[PDB]
Symmetry: D2
Subunit: 363 residues, 4 copies
């Protein structure tokens, strides 16, 4: 085929600049774009209600930390509502993140819907009018975006149709984003559920990353103006055989090494149902693995960067300072891990009180 410049060289420069500012060495992303119902679950768990004012409050907390976290966070992923929310001193949240030293992010997908004739599979929707939302959002104060899809490993899942769909739908969204100066973060989230061991996870991950990078090539997306946010190679949470961080490190680096091109600027690992300490330890391990790593390997933790701070606040407005402090600490730990310079804090077991959910309820 032959030439048809989708983006101008000027636009290309913009995307590269931004995509590169986010994944700077030592920085990572804080994912605080949880939807209304989702976050409602968090407030219920402690003893707090889920009101507008409260939401505005909790957010303001993580967002008002001291400048220790400044060289640690390259970006934050906000929820639509939060975008137009003001601080106590009247400062708009988007601007307040700017003052710290990071870029504004915004979730844009409109939830997953089911696929007919598949063993409980889904694809994500939300393309209708996307470009308009992006032009407006760029104007309002956001620079990049996050779009998620959900795949699961099982007997004979994911399906050819599922990997096919999501990978093309992700490329589709990506194209739109760039035409509006928005760096797209592609998130091919695989479920850590099941009795599949580590081997099966690595196998599934590769074939996915292959499917996603081909779809993007066909779609003419500017790789340098993108980011990848995948799951680490890990067995099902119900799996029997335990593995070491070294094995978890090797497996993850290997799959990416065989599927992610060096044009890609960064791989931002999500939390993935892991506790705070595990997340950090795995991040450090991945950045220690003796293999050639051309792209920055950082994090994009949601609750993995919160947990403590959450129950620290506990609704009790007076518990503010202590909470914020806990979170700041978790930020430093990660800043160190993404650069292979972190060391464990404690080998006891203060991690997750709802870990494997199959035996006797959850929400």
């Amino acid at each position: 085929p032959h030439s048809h410049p989708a983006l101008t060289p000027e636009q290309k420069k913009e995307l590269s600049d931004i995509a590169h500012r986010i994944v700077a060495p030592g920085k990572g992303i804080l994912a605080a774009d949880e939807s209304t119902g989702s976050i409602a679950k968090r407030l219920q768990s402690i003893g707090t209600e889920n009101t507008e004012e409260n939401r505005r409050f909790y957010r303001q907390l993580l967002l008002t930390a001291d400048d220790r976290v400044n060289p640690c966070i390259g970006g934050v992923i906000l929820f639509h509502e939060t975008l137009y929310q003001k601080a106590d001193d009247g400062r708009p949240f988007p601007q307040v993140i700017k003052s710290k030293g990071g870029v504004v992010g915004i979730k844009v997908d409109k939830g997953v819907v089911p696929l007919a004739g598949t063993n409980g599979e889904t694809t994500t929707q939300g393309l209708d009018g996307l470009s308009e939302r992006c032009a407006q959002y760029k104007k309002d104060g956001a620079d990049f975006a996050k779009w998620r899809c959900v795949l699961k490993i099982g007997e004979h899942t994911p399906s050819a149709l599922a990997i096919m769909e999501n990978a093309n739908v992700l490329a589709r969204y990506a194209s739109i984003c760039q035409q509006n100066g928005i760096v797209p973060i592609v998130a091919p989230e695989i479920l850590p559920d099941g009795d599949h061991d580590l081997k099966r996870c690595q196998y599934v991950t590769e074939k996915v990353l292959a499917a996603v990078y081909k779809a993007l090539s066909d779609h003419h997306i500017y790789l340098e103006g993108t980011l990848l946010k995948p799951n680490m190679v890990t067995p099902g949470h119900a799996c029997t055989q335990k593995y070491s961080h070294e094995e978890i490190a090797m497996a993850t680096v290997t799959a990416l090494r065989r599927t992610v091109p060096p044009a890609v600027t960064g791989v931002t690992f999500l939390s993935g149902g892991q506790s705070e300490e595990e997340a950090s330890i795995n991040l450090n391990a991945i950045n220690k693995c003796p293999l050639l790593k051309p792209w920055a390997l950082t994090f994009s933790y949601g609750r993995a960067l919160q947990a403590s701070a959450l129950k620290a606040w506990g609704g009790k407005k007076e518990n503010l300072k202590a909470a914020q402090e806990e979170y700041v600490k978790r930020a430093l730990a990660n800043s160190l891990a993404c650069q292979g310079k972190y060391t464990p804090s404690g080998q006891a077991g203060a991690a997750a009180s709802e870990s494997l959910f199959i035996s006797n309820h959850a929400y």
Copy 2:
């Protein structure tokens, strides 16, 4: 490759029923689903401004036609606004049609959107919420829907990307429609512009369809409960090469046979700017073709049915008899054509009616 029934015998049986009723021998489709804008223009050229009760009376005129049209009409495709309009007595339009023996349909796409670095090509949107909307429409009166995808022929069009995407989006629309118990029509309209010859048009038509039914397969579409709305096979509007209606017939059926599996219940053609008489002549020829045709070949005419009828409107109820019979005659002509029973009927009348150039400043 493990199957999963997206539909049960009961689900299937229903979709297969609605499809056979609309394409029943003699019956064709009335596509009067023009958007508020597109119809505003149609009205303005006869002293009628873009006002609701105008376009509500216009929709009523056609709908309130003498029972002679009952058989000619298998199905009527409506728009959101019209679907919720009542006739001058109290009964809503869905019921006016149902009492006449036709089946109700609804247009559900949300227009087109520019593509990822292509040659001015596009893809169609409208998947968000489609699911609930399909159920609300079912509850309200729609038993079938319409989605339109537009292709273009050129030195490098349609592109490989173009074909793939437009085919994937139609299949996703199709599935969701079938779950909600609504028959989905697939309309992959190629453009009749440019100086492309008949062979060019035919050949392009062949690639796109092959990929379409192949896309339908991958999503597990119940072929028997669907309708294909293709652009008839003809050269470009700028072509200087004359062709008989016979040649045009051949290119059409030949193209169909090679890509349309016999499971498909019916194929309804579009006009494409061609005069209503010619649309009827061509349609009649396609049906007189010696080649075996396993699927019904009828019509879905909008302009080719409203042209003259509207052209004979002056203001109120005066032409509310003159106009009706006009469209009635056209229904009676096309009903014969879908049966190879349309006597040539030499067009020995006044000029064709759409946008006729008597433009200076009259009287």
Copy 3:
């Protein structure tokens, strides 16, 4: 693709004329292409000497079937060896086939080879220097040729790579043939092995059939000059449920209706371990299935038309006239079968055969 003629109108016709003459009403193909090894399996199994002469005799035995067989046989496929073999009357085998009114065909494939990473599934080799061979074969008296690609239904098979590989390989073989003026017989044979039921067999047959034709489109294959040689949709040879001949028929017709374009001239069927009369019953049932099938449903049986003949023969040249009559008998039956006019006296038939699964000793 703008439009690039890969075949001329002159070229096309020749293909379609040969393609049609083979599948005329009553006609069917005799697949006596039992290779040097595969024949030994059925020759030196019963002690009969495996030798070129004995092989030479056997063929001429079937090839001398009087004029009664003529109308029943459209074409005969031979092994490379038999092509260059003459008869006792000094005449070379091809000339005799032709004087009978049948077309001469030959197997061009070079056997299957396993794929690394699959669960026992294979692909086929044999394209090297095929054009050269096709020229020599046309030159030598051959008008058509066949190539087989075998697939298997299992726990997780067939795999996407299986479907993809065998399908794209068939399309290549076909385009080589068409250029040399050779009618190709695509043969996606799915083996009846495994404890899978009827519906399952239909499902995996549907996807395999959708893939094959999409590939041909991409390769610019002329469907009007080809023949499809598939297997019948039946349960595995280890199923617990018995089904009626009407079921296998309805399952077979519906599947083809959902995948094969009306442009395809004919479909030749495989025996697949069926009894001679069982294959006969089935072929007759498919021809009377109330669904509208647009193609010629005929046979391409080998063992099913040759079983009794070998046995009747006994290696004694003195049983000649008996052995032939066994073949002739079967040809007639299936001649009546390929057109739904074959009913055993009484007009009621046998359903099951083995039943070593549909009883008590299966649980």
Copy 4:
């Protein structure tokens, strides 16, 4: 999809070992696999008869030089013929090559065959018997194989079919090599013929390479035990534009970086028709590209090493030492180039080269 191993750790390791040995710092590949007809091109030129005698003596001349270039050549590819020839010492050529400290490789493909419906595009053959052959070659001393794929850019080429077909045939070739302990060097050769610009070539390159590795994924290939032999991104032979060596590099490295997985152990650039001098200059430049280059960039040159050495021969025995020192000369400078340590840019205007398409005679 489902997990299915193809190679054991035993095989993987051995594969990586040979691969890394070849693409070692300072080492590159000598391509002396010139078929009888190809050899007859220049042997006739240097007044020497085309006989196995001098053909043997020529290849010998290349091997029997001084060990000053041993660190230079890591691999040598020959023709089937030379594999079983011997030197004046009495020992076989592969012995000579092994003792000299180099890996023996052989060409397995059987030329290019034309594809119908295309604008003069081909695809390679050879797969038949491949496995049996490679087994024979390895036992004989061969360790790596070569397969040439051809791709010409044009106003209508490469076509999807050309890119699809050719990529899968390479995946097939590799898989078989792996199962036989042979390291497959895949090479999608882009042709410099045409008037096209530098950007156009890069655009196509990126598309091709994306399709190549995608196919490698589905076929379950071990990329660590594979090598890539691509062309450098340059303008067409009839391009009226002038480009600087560094600019040529940039474009080439970007194409690779945008599509090639870190897993790929080495990238052996093909001569492509440049003068020995610039072949080294461009390769040299490519290594000075400040962008991250995670895979060895080296050479796979034939004429680019033998060119001057041929002139210094012309079928004479008195010039043994003569011709040799020219080869040693060529090899060394390229070892330095593969290290980015070859004399910088400057020598571009003392002699210039064939570029009549850039003078006033191109109008």
